[PDB]
Amino acid sequence: EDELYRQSLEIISRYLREQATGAKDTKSGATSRKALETLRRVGDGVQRNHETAFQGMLRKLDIKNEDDVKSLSRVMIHVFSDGVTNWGRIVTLISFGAFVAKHLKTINQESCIEPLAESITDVLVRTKRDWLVKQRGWDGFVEFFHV
């Protein structure tokens, strides 16, 4: 019933899971494909450049289980509390999400990766839908970061 939510979740969940597992997944394909490739290029870069800061942030969050996920949900909402939305903030959140997914994999909480992806998708689709639609969704995401 909500195609933008479904597509966004598909892109974000796939990226978070393949970052965690190290293998891509086998199971709107055109736009989603390009977005994922874009996310790999750009998102990996963010994690590399800001690995130290990401580590510090993770420790302060103290994520041990599914209920800890709400604490990231509150943090992510706070990011946009200044009324500003752009692709830079969105990719940064998705990148930190991938970083957290890696952490969940290392602490044997792999089942927490999906709820993680859903909470990130909740913040972006549920609270920033109008902006996302204005950017032509993930097609605009791909165009914004085209090189």
Binding site: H50, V75, V79, R89, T92
Partner: peptide
């Protein structure tokens, strides 16, 4: 704060990638 740091990082990301 974590949210403020993520904001800062997002800002660095843009300034590094603007062309």
């Amino acid at each position: 704060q974590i949210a403020r740091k993520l904001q800062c990082i997002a800002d660095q990301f843009h300034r590094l990638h603007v062309q």
